[PDB]
Amino acid sequence: MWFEILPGLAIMGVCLVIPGVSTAYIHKFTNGGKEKRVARVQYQWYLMERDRRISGVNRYYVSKGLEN
Amino acid sequence: MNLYTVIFINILLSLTLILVAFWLPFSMKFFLVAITFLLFDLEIALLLPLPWAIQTIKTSTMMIMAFILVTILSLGLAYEWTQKGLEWTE
Amino acid sequence: MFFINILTLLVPILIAMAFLTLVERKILGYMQLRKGPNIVGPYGILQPFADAMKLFMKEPMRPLTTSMSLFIIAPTLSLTLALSLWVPLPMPHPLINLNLGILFILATSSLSVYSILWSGWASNSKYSLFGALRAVAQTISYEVTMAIILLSVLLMNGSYSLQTLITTQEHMWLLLPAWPMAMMWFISTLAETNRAPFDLTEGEYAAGPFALFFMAEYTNIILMNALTTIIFLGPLYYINLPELYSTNFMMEALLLSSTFLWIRASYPRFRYDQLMHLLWKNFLPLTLALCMWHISLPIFTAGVPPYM
Amino acid sequence: MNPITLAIIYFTIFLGPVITMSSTNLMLMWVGLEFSLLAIIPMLINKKNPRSTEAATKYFVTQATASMIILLAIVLNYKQLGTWMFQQQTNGLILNMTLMALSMKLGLAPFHFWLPEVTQGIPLHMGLILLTWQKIAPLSILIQIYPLLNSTIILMLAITSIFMGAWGGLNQTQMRKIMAYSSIAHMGWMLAILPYNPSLTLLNLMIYIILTAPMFMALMLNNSMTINSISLLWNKTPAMLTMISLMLLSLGGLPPLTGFLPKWIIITELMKNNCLIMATLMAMMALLNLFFYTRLIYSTSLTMFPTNNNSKMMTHQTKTKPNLMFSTLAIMSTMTLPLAPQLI
Amino acid sequence: RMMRWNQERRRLLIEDLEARIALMPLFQAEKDRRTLQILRENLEEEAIIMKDVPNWKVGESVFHTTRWVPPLIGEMYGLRTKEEMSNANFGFTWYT
Amino acid sequence: PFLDIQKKLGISLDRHFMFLSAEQPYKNAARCHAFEKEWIECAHGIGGTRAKKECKIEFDDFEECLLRYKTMRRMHDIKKQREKLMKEGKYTPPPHHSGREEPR
Amino acid sequence: MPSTFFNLTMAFSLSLLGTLMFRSHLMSTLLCLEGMVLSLFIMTSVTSLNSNSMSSMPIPITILVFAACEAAVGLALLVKVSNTYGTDYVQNLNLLQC
Amino acid sequence: AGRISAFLKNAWAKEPVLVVSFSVWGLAIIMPMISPYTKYASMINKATPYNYPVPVRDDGNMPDVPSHPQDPLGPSLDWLKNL
Amino acid sequence: PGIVELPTLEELKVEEVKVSSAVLKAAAHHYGAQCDKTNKEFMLCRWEEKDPRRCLKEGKLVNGCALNFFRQIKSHCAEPFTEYWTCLDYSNMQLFRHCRQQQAKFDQCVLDKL
Amino acid sequence: MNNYIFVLSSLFLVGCLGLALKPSPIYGGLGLIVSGFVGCLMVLGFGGSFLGLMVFLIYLGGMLVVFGYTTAMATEEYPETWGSNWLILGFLVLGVIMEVFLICVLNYYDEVGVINLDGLGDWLMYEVDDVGVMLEGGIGVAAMYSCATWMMVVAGWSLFAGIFIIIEITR
Ligand SMILES: CCCCCCCCCCCCCCCCCC(=O)OC[C@H](COP(=O)(O)OCCN)OC(=O)CCCCCCCCCCCCCCCCC
Ligand SMILES: CCCCCCCCCCCCCCCCCC(=O)OC[C@H](COP(=O)(O)OCCN)OC(=O)CCCCCCCCCCCCCCCCC
């Protein structure tokens, strides 16, 4: 009956869900538990390069804070 | 570098599939259509920068010019219509 | 990590196409009062692999009067575009975060005419060239509205980026407004993908090329429905729940891709002349009118959006 | 062709040169040229015959290549100076490429081979425009940059144009090719005097226009596109000879007639500038234009050729063609030497 | 609803740009000091790199203006690493 | 131009975005704004023959700031001498040029 | 910049060479014309982006529009030539020599 | 009135699409003059600070310009909030 | 012709902030009111006198009066600020729309202790 | 990656050379498509996002498309063209090598002049606002609607009148 197309619908649904959460997790992993910073203009790129330069390990996502 | 990688990967995959495939074993109407499509695609080119034009101060001017564009495009369409350019009855 | 992300993006969409074939067959069967595939595997989940093996194991009878170059680079191009379209899609975070992403979609979609035309010019005949010219004209014509609809709907979010529509629909879908623009967008996706009732090009290739064309077709189907979901049916985005966004996006895209097949089983075909009259006399007037309406709306309303 | 189409095409034909002359931006000048081309082609091809199609194709290709070269010149100047206008600092090669392109747009030699073919394949009211109204924008672009041009190549082009125009008109038996070569010659005179005084280029331009328009109208009176067809004018319409002869002599440049003054004053300026050898060559080779204009004055007004019979019924019929502009322009072009100090 | 939402979006954009405003001075001073130090390093190197050449004034401007002329990124990262040059040119156009 | 109907009617269709020193949309400065401004302001009122000779220092400055041939040549001479010295073993690059330093 | 501009100018020159040298077709000349158009578009956009002169970006757009119109009328003329003779050849336009 | 209204009903029956297109055209060209919320668009797009507000010298005679962001002598767009 | 003039390395040497973008952004709206005068003076020098080499005496004061701000912040009311900018740095556009209540915490804390 | 834009410009050169040499109206279309792809790539390298994507979506998707369309419907491939195609492919090879020698001689004759091979990776970007928003290319191409409305009316009129012109030419 109509409930025999689900074995395929759910397969396709899982295959369509994988990309999103995979990309999100990989971003959080490669960028220090934070989102991947976007750069639509030069100001954000400048902020990013500046964070990278002050890190001391050449990585924009190593936030330093007040301690330094 | 990332876009390059992705497109290269896709091309490689396509060529690999199509290799495995082998290794396992006159009417003027269409021309007029193309021309109309040109004259509308160039209008798209002139129309695309509206998301940046509507951020300006001269709103009374952008309103005007966009209306001019759309109106005269519609008029050209109507004329191509009246003159039996959208018929296909040879 | 990036190559791993690319794999995670590519493999599942191909699996999803291969199983969308089966879903189509089963749905059409149950709408025709029959089952569809049941045997090869439990409920048929092996039939697509069986068909792939069969095709790729056949023997290619390459037309003798032809050109190998245009014979090989047409399906290569089709699949390359059908895969590179899925790249910028925010689901919710994109593999490649582009500005002007919808423009990249427009262009990489409009680039398929070249293959759908080179195949015909390669096949040395006149009937195939007739069919190719007609299909090219159809696709071309509907690209116009496919572009203007977005040109008018991207003024509720002042940017050509796909990662802005999430916050644009953070409170309400872009369907309630522009439901007349969707109804015209939902259809140009059929005619663009030569999908019934706009299949006047498949209603002349070896196993492998036919398979690549099939893959491209169904991939483009899923992607067009995904664009519909992202634009006119903005799903939920709680900053901490990309899982939620992806679940909802999947659900809506499956709804839409099943609607396509609903339609294929429900309606007859069109006649090329009437198909072109449809656009050039019903969709283009309304499209231009609503374009002017949506250029004026953000003005006589103070709701003109930002440029971030 | 319906009124709306006519209006749009002719408004474009009119707007092209107007933008060219009223714009400071070379891009807008180029725009005007493109308008002119786009809106001229359909009128050429109206009849839809092989000859008209071929003429249209030749015109399109030539003018499009020329426009591309002009736009290259503009882009190079833009990369060189940041401005969209030629100054006193542009690499002379840019300006010489521009001059080659403008010369091919006009029809100067050795960039002239297309003009007679096109004019022949084209009807009369279209040759009129092509040879009078389509010389004003490309000449304006030059008038705007006359201080920074190359007299050497300008004079070579002008003298080549004089020579080839004479040696073409000597042979052609077709009204339209004769007019084409006359245009070539007068445009050569213009270019010659340009870098020293452009007011005289404009003088000769208006003189040549006043002299050409009424001639094409005379022809269109009977659609006499040939010598043996215009010879019957003594039986068809003999009240036009007294003026065809005078206008042809003026074109030739005979002293007592308007058409003289251009050559005379241009030679004067060239003498003030010590271009006497070139002025002499040109003045001696204009006599061939005068020759093959006298050969037509003969067959038209000083001797009667064998006529035909149905010309009797042509006499029976009346006519209302030659509007007032014919007489006005012919008089202004034949009897206006006493007013030369004002036209100068 | 779209009007009432995009107006709040405008207010938020103004807030972000105001933060940018408040920050800019710090950034401009830091950038000036950075580029000045870059040019000073390049000069202090050129001094000895080009000592034995004939008729070479060390620090010779190509202008007769006497005023400040912002340097080119080529001038700055010309003696530095090619990866630095590539980050300067194809660094923002290459998706973060 | 050839027919100053624009200046007659006191309007501007094409004569406000000709050169670099003109008005840009969001006040964004162009590269050679000051050099071109100076050249124009100094050549205003003496047009042509004079400005080609007694307004030439400023045109040279504009040409250099726009085309940069002299700067290119300078940097190239420096790099050539440096390559020769490194090849022959009479000079070594410093750390910040080699690729390592303490940044700001 | 210098190198890419030199190569762009060489390409324009090559396409003009192709135009001035026919090879029995006419499409192969219209395509050279469009190559010229493309080279000029690219050079103009590149100079605009190099100088940061955002008051000159409409120029590529305009020239693209007008090149499109020129190409359209050229294609129409070619279509008529084919409709009449049977080929987009150039030896068939031997008329007007009399 | 009668003849033209019958024409409009004939249209409304035959080609509703053309009617809707033309009516949307008219609405677009007309409503921006009726609406009161129009001016606010230019007001906002002016109020957006994409650039640095370069200050000026306190040369004495300038009482209607503040010396600190938090003074009421300058403009204040509370109307945006109230919007 | 003309020997360019530059400043030495001993100078243009100052205690930088070494603080990150999210932090500067969480502290901007207060750093725009406090420490405004010595910022406007510098952004007037740098625009009147087009040379940066003529505003180092002002850029150093900028850095100093910014360190004093970030030192007041540490002395009093460090934890709300820490959590606020930690929540900010999570996003990509570093948006103020998600961290609205931690911002109220920072604001109340600073308004009470300062 | 210093050689990036140089490689792109060289590919554009080779495409325009394969145009100059005239294989056929279809392989010429393919050459045009390649050259346009490369032109967009180099425009993006120079920062022209909008310009390059517009090239993509209009020049290729709109112009070369109708070029190939009109070609197929109004052109016939004759058998002779194949031997001559191979001949002009060899011609193309020879031209490539001649261009290489040309570039070598020009580098030998002008170090910092025609092409600064030493400074290849340099002299691509001269200046840029680092802390600046609102400096993309759309901000300029959208000037048309506020300043330079003259260009917009010009272009719209060209397109408008093209309709009448083409209907009258084809008819
Ligand atoms: C034999 C079979 C042949 C079939 C081949 C078919 C291949 C076609 C594949 C589809 C074509 C895709 C077109 C790619 C255009 C990229 C447009 C784009 O948006 O990239 C711009 C990118 C980001 O810039 P932006 O978004 O403006 O802002 C970023 C600031 N954060 O900034 C950048 O510029 C990124 C660098 C550009 C990368 C583009 C590379 C595209 C893929 C290259 C394909 C090469 C194929 C082989 C050669 C083709 C023929 C010569
Ligand atoms: C003062 C200072 C001097 C300055 C230098 C002066 C330059 C020289 C002046 C040259 C003026 C004439 C030159 C052109 C000669 C024209 C030849 C001509 O018209 O005669 C031929 C023709 C004969 O026609 P046919 O068929 O033989 O029989 C008569 C029927 N009309 O004749 C015709 O058919 C004519 C048309 C008939 C119209 C009816 C008759 C009305 C009169 C028309 C002729 C007017 C001529 C005016 C002469 C004034 C001379 C100054």
PDB file of C-alpha atoms and ligand atoms in Angstrom, chain D residues 238-239 242 301 304, ligand 2:
ATOM      1  CA  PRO D 238      13.004  69.607 -70.211  1.00  0.00           C
ATOM      2  CA  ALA D 239      12.393  72.339 -67.614  1.00  0.00           C
ATOM      3  CA  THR D 242      18.784  74.672 -67.204  1.00  0.00           C
ATOM      4  CA  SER D 301      21.097  69.471 -72.235  1.00  0.00           C
ATOM      5  CA  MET D 304      19.143  65.225 -78.053  1.00  0.00           C
TER       6      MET D 304
HETATM    7  C1  LIG K   2      25.344  87.893 -66.218  1.00  0.00           C
HETATM    8  C2  LIG K   2      26.718  87.361 -65.834  1.00  0.00           C
HETATM    9  C3  LIG K   2      26.939  86.031 -66.550  1.00  0.00           C
HETATM   10  C4  LIG K   2      27.416  84.981 -65.548  1.00  0.00           C
HETATM   11  C5  LIG K   2      27.679  83.656 -66.262  1.00  0.00           C
HETATM   12  C6  LIG K   2      26.378  83.108 -66.842  1.00  0.00           C
HETATM   13  C7  LIG K   2      26.532  81.608 -67.071  1.00  0.00           C
HETATM   14  C8  LIG K   2      25.869  81.209 -68.387  1.00  0.00           C
HETATM   15  C9  LIG K   2      24.355  81.131 -68.216  1.00  0.00           C
HETATM   16  C10 LIG K   2      23.912  79.710 -68.549  1.00  0.00           C
HETATM   17  C11 LIG K   2      22.397  79.577 -68.411  1.00  0.00           C
HETATM   18  C12 LIG K   2      21.890  78.400 -69.244  1.00  0.00           C
HETATM   19  C13 LIG K   2      22.808  77.188 -69.086  1.00  0.00           C
HETATM   20  C14 LIG K   2      22.019  75.893 -69.271  1.00  0.00           C
HETATM   21  C15 LIG K   2      21.546  75.729 -70.712  1.00  0.00           C
HETATM   22  C16 LIG K   2      20.152  75.108 -70.704  1.00  0.00           C
HETATM   23  C17 LIG K   2      19.862  74.455 -72.053  1.00  0.00           C
HETATM   24  C18 LIG K   2      18.381  74.604 -72.389  1.00  0.00           C
HETATM   25  O1  LIG K   2      17.582  74.711 -71.521  1.00  0.00           O
HETATM   26  O2  LIG K   2      17.969  74.620 -73.723  1.00  0.00           O
HETATM   27  C19 LIG K   2      17.611  73.360 -74.203  1.00  0.00           C
HETATM   28  C20 LIG K   2      16.101  73.200 -74.060  1.00  0.00           C
HETATM   29  C21 LIG K   2      15.449  73.142 -75.438  1.00  0.00           C
HETATM   30  O3  LIG K   2      14.282  72.374 -75.396  1.00  0.00           O
HETATM   31  P1  LIG K   2      13.671  71.853 -76.835  1.00  0.00           P
HETATM   32  O4  LIG K   2      13.029  70.499 -76.653  1.00  0.00           O
HETATM   33  O5  LIG K   2      14.786  71.751 -77.846  1.00  0.00           O
HETATM   34  O6  LIG K   2      12.554  72.933 -77.381  1.00  0.00           O
HETATM   35  C22 LIG K   2      12.192  73.985 -76.538  1.00  0.00           C
HETATM   36  C23 LIG K   2      11.216  73.470 -75.488  1.00  0.00           C
HETATM   37  N1  LIG K   2      11.564  74.042 -74.205  1.00  0.00           N
HETATM   38  O7  LIG K   2      15.602  74.300 -73.355  1.00  0.00           O
HETATM   39  C24 LIG K   2      14.493  74.016 -72.552  1.00  0.00           C
HETATM   40  O8  LIG K   2      13.741  73.156 -72.862  1.00  0.00           O
HETATM   41  C25 LIG K   2      14.258  74.821 -71.277  1.00  0.00           C
HETATM   42  C26 LIG K   2      12.966  74.376 -70.588  1.00  0.00           C
HETATM   43  C27 LIG K   2      11.735  74.978 -71.268  1.00  0.00           C
HETATM   44  C28 LIG K   2      10.906  75.766 -70.251  1.00  0.00           C
HETATM   45  C29 LIG K   2       9.997  76.770 -70.959  1.00  0.00           C
HETATM   46  C30 LIG K   2      10.798  77.993 -71.407  1.00  0.00           C
HETATM   47  C31 LIG K   2      11.005  78.962 -70.244  1.00  0.00           C
HETATM   48  C32 LIG K   2      12.453  79.449 -70.241  1.00  0.00           C
HETATM   49  C33 LIG K   2      13.352  78.364 -69.651  1.00  0.00           C
HETATM   50  C34 LIG K   2      14.820  78.672 -69.928  1.00  0.00           C
HETATM   51  C35 LIG K   2      15.312  79.791 -69.013  1.00  0.00           C
HETATM   52  C36 LIG K   2      16.777  80.067 -69.341  1.00  0.00           C
HETATM   53  C37 LIG K   2      17.231  81.373 -68.695  1.00  0.00           C
HETATM   54  C38 LIG K   2      18.432  81.897 -69.477  1.00  0.00           C
HETATM   55  C39 LIG K   2      19.087  83.048 -68.719  1.00  0.00           C
HETATM   56  C40 LIG K   2      20.507  83.246 -69.243  1.00  0.00           C
HETATM   57  C41 LIG K   2      21.282  84.156 -68.295  1.00  0.00           C
END
